[PDB]
């Protein structure tokens, strides 16, 4: 299983993904990227069955870039979320269902930061903070404890580090490294990968 | 430039105007343009050529007196440059040249002009460029169908143009030969030029040439003297038979039998005669009941038993 | 001047009860090079005059293998010919696949008749302007089948098509009695002389321009090109 | 072939546009025709970005250009999907040209009626310039023009294009301006410029941005005298 | 099956066993489990031998078509993606494929892993097959980007040898390939007995 | 040349009373307007040459290619606009790769031109092609007419003045001709028909041999060649 996390702040959204992709017993790649850039201020996260994640993320990415090229302005994160939800829901009852779990995080000039959650059933909900994977069961309580609507981004980083420390301490699957990125009105900005 | 030289005119009882005069200008142009007709000088010559060409096509429909005698001297150079087909790859100097040739050819000439223009046509025809010879033939075609009555009034013109057409009918190059044949067919069709016993015996002699039937196995990169003469003879007969597409005259059956003789001749003679016969068959079919009466039964069955189909058939 | 209203399209009947387009397409096969087909008691041959656009050009392939036991010689349009060849090849293959059996020639020509007839009745689909000599050996015996753009087909002791077929037809109908009891080489020689009947006096049959296609009870359909035809050609007496 | 002549005449009527190829840069210029007193200039572009790494300028019928542009955009994205790589400029040119010779749904004006300049940077990074024709023939150029007066511009481009002119990227831009200036007599705002600037997305120049370049060449024109 | 591949400075290595087994029985000991897609690419066989062979041959087809149309040799990433798309078209239908696509491209040496499950990933090192685990161990212990060429060859031979020694369904002869910037080669193919005789002392 | 016309022409799918299909025959007549090209078949190998006809210096010379590679062992040349040909070229490439995929063997030039003619049927299609490549039989040259008919030719010329070149080809050609001798010969023919000084920019030359694959002569190689004659 793969671990995802999202934290919404007043002026920012913080996301992390584990960067391990694996076979049954052995981890082939220690630097896999589960973060996909739909647009300048929008990030799509995907975890789930092999292949389906990649194909779906790519399709959504291309349709978003297409909207940008056609119309000259990037989509709202809300809109991209609803578009993703539409596609995934259509695929659900199709012959080929994509089994994926998503976080769509982005910043809007008008509406500011947002964080969305989508399960493989393609139900959508906007939350202040969210996670996917087995680790989410562990870290959501941490988030509930130390969250505030007014978190400063450094404090959010410290919080995230606490959650990953919980993972390393308890969660059976080795998750050595998590890549981190922050969304801002300025744009997406990378950060030093939290590692152990 | 056209508007500059418009005031100079050849209208009756016109004093020589003080305005700019076209012959001196064309003289300057020709003098600068001699090298084209150094490497750097050649390019300047080409640019000047472009400008004067634009001037000619502009002054085609405007000038009161077209075909000033000095400007005809440019036609050799315009001829050699011009293309043998219509295409956009030619860089559009040649396209302009083709347009200019067509426009100037579609222009009236005075009676005094036509010997001069025919002399120029004779001069360019002996030029090496096969492109040039093709162009002079087609220019001659349209320039004759216009002012045909002028050319017809001048008998020396008919003699010279006849000689030139038959002379180029025997040229080494196949394209100019076929073009000469087509020009001949048109000249015959309009009756500006009329075939007779001399043309018939000339073509029959040229066709009645024995091929060498030999080659050097151990070792010219040029065709040969025999087959070109054969080709020119059959081309003469083809121009004659195609002279009358929608009617058959009395000599045409004999000419047709003579063509059917050469049907098995080696190429290019075979392709030529097959095309001519196919054209005859398509054209004359409309009133074949009327046409057949002129023919004999043996001629008729011989013509029916002809394989003139193209390659794709079979 | 004498433009005819009713030859515009094949679907149009004339008041004279004729399809001018079909008649004209039947006129087209004569455009092609002459070809001769004849049979003995136990053999059948197809002798064709291949022709070239140029001396360098190699020559057109008039004779074709439909199957081991069937061959054809095309006249008229080569496109229509290749369509028919593909259809016939597929049909023969289907028959061998299904029934483990060679296809009967009568059956094959019947299928060709249906396929050819279809365009005649439909607007916008021009007739197959091709004439074929279909030759093969089956259980019944050797056969020679002619087909035309009209989609009619015939069975013949011998037949010639293409340009100047009539002289060959005359020689063949003169010597048809002899052909039946003839051995293979003599039958081939007769076909060659008949093909020569169509030729002009200037032209003479050669190895290159001659193609012989032959079938027998114990012999599959073969084609002889230039060298393979030379033994048959050499024996032939000089033309009158 | 007959529709092609009408299409070629149509693009001949259309607004002028040029493209230039430079070592780390490619520039695309199109004259901005006056619209009206009351129209808004936003909707009219005459420039389109098929992808991050591709830009296009068309000349001819606007609606047909819109159709072409949309189809090429979607093709660019689908090729990125199938191949995981940026589309090659030759490829998208081949598609746009290939789109011309499918047709309209009715086959009316099978040539859609635009000859367009496609410019972009290869994935390896090499600059590319191409054009298309209504006929479907497509070529590559060091530089080219389309639309009205393009032939006169090509003569100017023929002599002006040099290693020295391309040696400076800003000079690579200025050469395009001079080409348009010969084509268009407005000598100012009636122009639109777009630059790819290797490894970054297309940045349309500001009206002040073009203005200073125009002034610089205008000064250099002054300096020669 | 045991196959492996790793990228190092000089280029890409590909190693594979020759054993091919249906059940306990060994049908063939001499199988070339590495596929020459084209002179500039390699493919690796794992899982379904027939599936991998067919789909890799079809990949070679598409790559040659692309080469002719575009007049450029296709990117390794592109080939891996194309293959991934083809197999994903058939996902859930019982295909078993795992492979390592190896080539040099404009970007650099390329190594991509592709599975019938749909995974597509690039890596410095990879192994696939029944003995892949045992291969991963030795190669991970021995690997660096800075290896000498002969050291890499020997390391691959060690990996395949030990993986065969552990795993039943792997065996036969090591077949070793080096993909160079110019093009690939077959460095050598050695039977397991010679390897054991070498390493035993 | 006054108007010569008949009622039966202009019909696409109508046989004339003679049996001829005049509309398509005319269409073939137009297709021959393309640029002149020459192909020479020899025991040593196949030499193909063609005139480039670039408009302007700015145009990238490589961008316009009048010779293409169907396969490593095959070369093809076309007359007329490339766009009409591109469909046939793509079909030829994809077909030879179908052959390779299915049979692990190289497709013969006869089979390739056959399959292209099989496309051409399945309009006049306005292209003339001259396939040249080496095969197991040997070096071969096949000319595919815009009719769709295909024949082997010891030598052949296509384009604006294919016939005039063809007559020259008749005189010069012989079976003992080397590929080098053919190249010098073929260049001579193009010089005459073009009536322009031959240089690297105005022609493209390519060859196929048993020893080597399809190789298009680079600009330096073409310079060495024309300088020789």
Swiss-Prot record, chain B:
It is found in: Cytoplasm, Cytosol; Nucleus; Nucleus speckle. The modification Phosphoserine is found at residue 89. HEAT repeats lie at residues 111-149, 155-193. Residues 125-213 are annotated as: Bromodomain-like (BRDL). Signal peptide: none annotated. Homodimer. Interacts with the 20S and 26S proteasomes. Component of the spermatoproteasome, a form of the proteasome specifically found in testis. Associated component of the proteasome that specifically recognizes acetylated histones and promotes ATP- and ubiquitin-independent degradation of core histones during spermatogenesis and DNA damage response. Recognizes and binds acetylated histones via its bromodomain-like (BRDL) region and activates the proteasome by opening the gated channel for substrate entry. Binds to the core proteasome via its C-terminus, which occupies the same binding sites as the proteasomal ATPases, opening the closed structure of the proteasome via an active gating mechanism. Belongs to the BLM10 family. The bromodomain-like (BRDL) region specifically recognizes and binds acetylated histones. This is Proteasome activator complex subunit 4. It comes from Homo sapiens. The gene is PSME4. The chain holds residues 1509 to 1843 of 1843 of the full protein.
From Swiss-Prot, chain C:
The keyword Glycoprotein applies. The modification Phosphoserine is found at residues 110, 177. Gene3D superfamilies: Glutamine Phosphoribosylpyrophosphate, subunit 1, domain 1. The keyword Phosphoprotein applies. SMART domains: Proteasome_A_N. Keywords: Acetylation, Cytoplasm, Glycoprotein, Immunity, Isopeptide bond, Nucleus, Phosphoprotein, Proteasome, Ubl conjugation. GO terms for biological process: immune system process; negative regulation of inflammatory response to antigenic stimulus; proteasome-mediated ubiquitin-dependent protein catabolic process. It is found in: Cytoplasm; Nucleus. There is a cross-link at residues 115, 208 (Glycyl lysine isopeptide (Lys-Gly) (interchain with G-Cter in ubiquitin)). Glycans are attached at residue 110. One of its GO terms (cellular component) is cytoplasm. It comes from the Eukaryota. Pfam families: Proteasome (PF00227), Proteasome_A_N (PF10584). SUPFAM superfamilies: N-terminal nucleophile aminohydrolases (Ntn hydrolases) (SSF56235). Induction: Induced in breast cancer tissue (at protein level). Up-regulated in liver tumor tissues. InterPro entries: Ntn_hydrolases_N, Proteasome_alpha, Proteasome_alpha-type, Proteasome_alpha1, Proteasome_asu_N, Proteasome_sua/b. One of its GO terms (molecular function) is lipopolysaccharide binding. The modification N-acetylmethionine is found at residue 1. Component of the 20S core proteasome complex involved in the proteolytic degradation of most intracellular proteins. This complex plays numerous essential roles within the cell by associating with different regulatory particles. Associated with two 19S regulatory particles, forms the 26S proteasome and thus participates in the ATP-dependent degradation of ubiquitinated proteins. PANTHER family: PROTEASOME SUBUNIT ALPHA/BETA. Belongs to the peptidase T1A family. This is Proteasome subunit alpha type-1.
From Swiss-Prot, chain D:
InterPro entries: Ntn_hydrolases_N, Proteasome_alpha, Proteasome_alpha-type, Proteasome_asu_N, Proteasome_sua/b. Induction: Down-regulated by the ribozyme Rz3'X. Up-regulated in colorectal cancer tissues. GO terms for molecular function: identical protein binding. Disulfide bonds: none annotated. Changing residue 138 to F: Displays impaired G1/S transition and S/G2 progression. Phosphorylation by ABL1 or ABL2 leads to an inhibition of proteasomal activity and cell cycle transition blocks. Glycans are attached at residue 115. The modification N6-acetyllysine is found at residue 212. Coiled coil: none annotated. It is found in: Cytoplasm; Nucleus. One of its GO terms (cellular component) is nucleoplasm. It comes from the Eukaryota. Gene3D superfamilies: Glutamine Phosphoribosylpyrophosphate, subunit 1, domain 1. GO terms for biological process: proteasome-mediated ubiquitin-dependent protein catabolic process. Its main location: cytoplasm. The modification Phosphotyrosine is found at residue 138. Component of the 20S core proteasome complex involved in the proteolytic degradation of most intracellular proteins. This complex plays numerous essential roles within the cell by associating with different regulatory particles. Associated with two 19S regulatory particles, forms the 26S proteasome and thus participates in the ATP-dependent degradation of ubiquitinated proteins. Belongs to the peptidase T1A family. This is Proteasome subunit alpha type-7. The gene is PSMA7.
UniProtKB/Swiss-Prot annotation, chain E:
GO terms for molecular function: endopeptidase activity; peptidase activity; threonine-type endopeptidase activity. Its EC number is 3.4.25.1. Changing residue 50 to V: Displays high resistance to the bortezomib, a proteasome inhibitor of the chymotrypsin-like activity. Bortezomib binds at residue 49. One of its GO terms (biological process) is response to oxidative stress. Induction: Down-regulated by IFNG/IFN-gamma (at protein level). Induced in breast cancer tissue. Up-regulated by sulforaphane in breast cancer cells. GO terms for cellular component: centrosome; cytoplasm; cytosol; extracellular exosome; nucleoplasm; nucleus; proteasome complex; proteasome core complex. The active site is at 1 (nucleophile). Keywords: Cytoplasm, Host-virus interaction, Hydrolase, Nucleus, Protease, Proteasome, Threonine protease, Zymogen. It is an enzyme of class 3 (hydrolase). It is found in: Cytoplasm; Nucleus. It catalyses: Cleavage of peptide bonds with very broad specificity. Component of the 20S core proteasome complex involved in the proteolytic degradation of most intracellular proteins. This complex plays numerous essential roles within the cell by associating with different regulatory particles. Associated with two 19S regulatory particles, forms the 26S proteasome and thus participates in the ATP-dependent degradation of ubiquitinated proteins. Belongs to the peptidase T1B family. This is Proteasome subunit beta type-5.
């Amino acid at each position: 299983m793969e671990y995802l996390i999202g934290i919404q702040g007043p002026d920012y959204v913080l996301v992390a993904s584990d960067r391990v992709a694996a076979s049954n017993i052995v981890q082939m790649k220690d630097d896999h990227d589960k973060m996909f850039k739909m647009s300048e201020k929008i990030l799509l996260l995907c975890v789930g069955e092999a292949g389906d994640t990649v194909q779906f993320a790519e399709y959504i990415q291309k349709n978003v870039q297409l909207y940008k090229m056609r119309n000259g302005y990037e989509l709202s994160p809300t809109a991209a979320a609803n578009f993703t939800r539409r596609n995934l829901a259509d695929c659900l009852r199709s012959r080929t269902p994509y089994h994926v779990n998503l976080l769509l995080a982005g910043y809007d000039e008008h509406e500011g930061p947002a964080l969305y959650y989508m399960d493989y059933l393609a139900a959508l909900a906007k939350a202040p903070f969210a996670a996917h994977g087995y680790g989410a069961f562990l870290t959501l309580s941490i988030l509930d404890r130390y969250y505030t609507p007014t978190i400063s981004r450094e404090r959010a980083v410290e919080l995230l580090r606490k959650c990953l420390e919980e993972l390393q301490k308890r969660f059976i699957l080795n998750l050595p490294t998590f890549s981190v990125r922050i969304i801002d009105k300025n744009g997406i900005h990378d950060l030093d990968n939290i590692s152990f | 430039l056209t508007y500059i030289f418009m005031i100079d005119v050849s209208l009756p009882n016109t004093t020589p105007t003080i305005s700019p005069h076209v012959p001196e200008f064309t003289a300057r142009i020709l003098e600068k343009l001699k090298p084209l007709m150094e490497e750097d000088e050649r390019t300047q010559g080409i640019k000047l050529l472009k400008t004067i060409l634009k001037w000619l096509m502009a002054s085609a429909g405007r000038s009161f007196s077209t075909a000033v005698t000095e400007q005809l001297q440019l036609l050799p150079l315009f001829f050699k440059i011009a293309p043998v087909e219509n295409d956009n790859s030619y860089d559009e100097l040649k396209r302009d040249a083709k347009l200019c040739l067509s426009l100037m050819s579609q222009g009236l000439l005075y009676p005094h002009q036509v010997p001069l223009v025919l002399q120029v046509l004779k001069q360019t025809a002996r030029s090496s460029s096969w492109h040039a010879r093709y162009t002079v033939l087609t220019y001659l075609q349209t320039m004759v169908f216009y002012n045909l009555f002028i050319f017809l009034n001048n008998e020396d013109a008919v003699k010279d143009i006849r000689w030139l057409v038959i002379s180029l009918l025997e040229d080494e190059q196949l394209e100019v030969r076929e073009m000469a044949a087509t020009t001949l067919s048109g000249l015959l069709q309009c009756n500006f030029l009329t075939m007779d016993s001399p043309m018939q015996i000339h073509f029959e002699q040229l066709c009645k040439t024995k091929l060498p039937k030999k080659r050097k196995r151990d070792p010219d990169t040029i065709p040969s003297a025999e087959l070109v003469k054969r080709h020119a003879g059959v081309l003469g007969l083809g121009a004659c038979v195609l002279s009358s597409p929608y009617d058959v005259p009395t000599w045409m059956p004999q000419l047709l039998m003579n063509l059917s003789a050469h049907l098995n001749d080696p190429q290019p003679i075979e392709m030529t005669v097959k095309k001519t016969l196919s054209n005859f068959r398509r054209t004359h079919h409309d009133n074949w009941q009327e046409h057949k009466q002129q023919f004999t039964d043996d001629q008729l069955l011989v013509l029916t038993d002809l394989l003139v189909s193209p390659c794709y058939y079979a | 001047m004498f433009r005819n209203q009713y030859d515009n399209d094949v679907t149009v009947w004339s008041p004279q009860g004729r399809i001018h387009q079909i008649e004209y397409a039947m006129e087209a096969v004569k455009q092609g090079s002459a070809t001769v087909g004849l049979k003995s008691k136990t053999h059948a041959v197809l002798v064709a005059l291949k022709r070239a656009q140029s001396e360098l050009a190699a020559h057109q392939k008039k004779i074709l293998h439909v199957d081991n036991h069937i061959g054809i010689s095309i006249a008229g349009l080569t496109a229509d010919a290749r369509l028919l060849c593909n259809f016939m090849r597929q049909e023969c293959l289907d028959s061998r696949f299904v029934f483990d059996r060679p296809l009967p020639v009568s059956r094959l020509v019947s299928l060709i008749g249906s396929k050819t007839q279809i365009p005649t009745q439909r607007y916008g689909r021009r007739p197959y302007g091709v004439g074929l000599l279909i030759a093969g050996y089956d259980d019944m015996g050797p056969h020679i089948f002619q087909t035309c753009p009209s989609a009619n087909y015939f069975d013949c002791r011998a037949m010639s098509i293409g340009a100047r077929s009539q002289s060959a037809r005359t020689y063949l109908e003169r010597h048809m009695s002899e052909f039946m009891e003839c051995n293979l080489n003599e039958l081939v020689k007769h076909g060659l002389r008949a093909l020569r009947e169509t030729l002009p006096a200037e032209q003479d049959l050669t190895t290159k321009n001659v193609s012989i296609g032959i079938v027998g009870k114990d012999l599959e359909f073969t084609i002889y090109d230039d060298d393979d035809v030379s033994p048959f050609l050499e024996g032939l007496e000089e033309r009158p | 072939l007959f529709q092609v002549e009408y299409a070629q005449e149509a693009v001949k009527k259309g607004s002028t546009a040029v493209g230039v190829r430079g070592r780390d840069i490619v520039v695309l210029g199109v004259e901005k025709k006056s619209v009206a007193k009351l129209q808004d200039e936003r909707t009219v572009r005459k420039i389109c970005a098929l992808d991050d790494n591709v830009c296009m300028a068309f000349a001819g019928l606007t609606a047909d250009a819109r159709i072409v542009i949309n189809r090429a955009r979607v093709e660019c994205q689908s090729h990125r999907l199938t191949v995981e790589d940026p589309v090659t400029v030759e490829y998208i040119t081949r598609y746009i040209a290939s789109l011309k010779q499918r047709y309209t749904q009715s086959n009316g004006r099978r040539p859609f009626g635009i000859s367009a300049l496609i410019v972009g940077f290869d994935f390896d990074g090499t600059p590319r310039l191409y054009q298309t024709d209504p006929s479907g023939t497509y070529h590559a150029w060091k530089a080219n023009a389309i639309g009205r007066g393009a032939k006169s511009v090509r003569e100017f481009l023929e002599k002006n294009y040099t290693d020295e002119a391309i040696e400076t990227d800003d000079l690579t831009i200025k050469l395009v301006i001079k080409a348009l200036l010969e084509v268009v007599q407005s000598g100012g705002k009636n122009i639109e410029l777009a630059v790819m600037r290797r490894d970054q997305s297309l940045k349309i120049l500001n009206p002040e941005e073009i203005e200073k370049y125009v002034a610089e060449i205008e000064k250099e024109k002054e300096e020669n005298e | 099956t045991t196959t492996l591949a790793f990228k190092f400075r000089h280029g890409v290595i590909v190693a594979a066993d020759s054993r091919a087994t249906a059940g306990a029985y060994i049908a063939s000991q001499t199988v070339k489990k590495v596929i020459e897609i084209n002179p500039y690419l390699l493919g690796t066989m794992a899982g379904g031998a027939a599936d991998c062979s067919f789909w890799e041959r079809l990949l070679a087809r598409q790559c040659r078509i692309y080469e002719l149309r575009n007049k450029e040799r296709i990117s390794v990433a592109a080939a891996s993606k194309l293959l991934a798309n083809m197999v994903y078209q058939y996902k859930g239908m019982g295909l078993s494929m795992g492979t390592m696509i190896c080539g040099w491209d404009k970007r650099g040496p390329g190594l991509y892993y592709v599975d019938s499950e749909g995974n597509r990933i690039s890596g410095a090192t990879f192994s696939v097959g029944s003995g892949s685990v045992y291969a991963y161990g030795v190669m991970d212990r021995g690997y660096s980007y800075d290896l000498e060429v002969e050291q890499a060859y020997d390391l691959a031979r060690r990996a395949i040898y030990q993986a065969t020694y552990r795993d039943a369904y792997s065996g036969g002869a090591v077949n070793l390939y080096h993909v160079r910037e110019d093009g690939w080669i077959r460095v050598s193919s050695d039977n397991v007995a010679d390897l054991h005789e070498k390493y035993s002392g | 040349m006054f108007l010569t016309r008949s009622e039966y022409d202009r019909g696409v799918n109508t046989f004339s009373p003679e049996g001829r299909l005049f509309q398509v025959e005319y269409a073939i007549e137009a297709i021959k307007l393309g640029s002149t090209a020459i192909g020479i078949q020899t025991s040593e190998g196949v030499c193909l040459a063609v005139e480039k006809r670039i408009t302007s210096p700015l145009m990238e010379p490589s961008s316009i290619e009048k010779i293409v590679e169907i396969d490593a062992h095959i070369g093809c040349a076309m007359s007329g606009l490339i766009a009409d040909a591109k469909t046939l070229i793509d079909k030829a490439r994809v077909e030879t790769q179908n052959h390779w995929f299915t049979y692990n063997e190289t497709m013969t030039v006869e089979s390739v031109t056959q399959a292209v003619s099989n496309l051409a049927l399945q309009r006049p299609f306005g292209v003339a092609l001259l396939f040249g490549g080496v095969d197991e039989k040997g070096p071969q040259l096949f000319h595919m007419d815009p009719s769709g008919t295909f024949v082997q030719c010891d030598a052949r010329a296509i384009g604006s003045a294919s016939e005039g070149a063809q007559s020259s080809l008749q005189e010069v050609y012989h079976k003992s001709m080397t590929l080098k001798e053919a190249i010098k010969s073929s260049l001579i023919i193009l010089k005459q028909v073009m009536e322009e000084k031959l240089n690297a920019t105005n022609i493209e030359l390519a060859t196929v041999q048993p020893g080597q694959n399809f190789h298009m002569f680079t600009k330096e190689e073409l310079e060495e060649v024309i300088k020789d004659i």
